[PDB]
């Protein structure tokens, strides 16, 4: 139950409702919906401050195994790439689990996700 008002709080930037959950202990990698991560919601729409957060505690930064992807693509296309900067900052490699150069290559066109692939 309150499954929404966890997922929700990675959407509209509740920081402060997913800081309670992994006030608990160190919970950050958990099936958020049913074969997803907490991290998708928050680096596709996390304020790009929520992304950082339950980042910095466990590492869902590469955990996904069944994604065969990472979240830092999943703000790629997205426009936000304002994560994605701060991302690498903590390591996060650069093509970890994505499919090959697709990254940033076969990812877009623009100048902002390319700066992640300098």
């Not at 505690?57 to 790629?76: E, F, R, W, Y």
């Not at 900067?85 to 390319?114: C, M």
């Amino acid at each position: 139950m309150c499954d929404k008002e966890f997922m929700w709080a990675l959407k509209n930037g509740d920081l402060d409702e997913v800081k309670d959950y992994v006030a608990k202990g160190e919970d950050v990698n958990r099936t958020l919906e049913g074969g997803r991560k907490p991290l998708h919601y928050a680096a596709d729409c996390g304020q790009l401050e929520i992304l950082e957060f339950l980042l910095l505690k466990g590492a869902d930064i590469n955990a996904p195994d069944k994604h065969h992807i990472t979240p830092l693509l999943s703000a790629v296309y997205e426009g936000h790439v304002s994560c994605v900067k701060l991302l690498l900052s903590k390591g996060a490699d650069k093509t970890v689990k994505g499919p090959d150069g697709l990254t940033a290559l076969e990812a877009t066109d623009n100048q902002a996700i390319k700066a992640l692939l300098q």
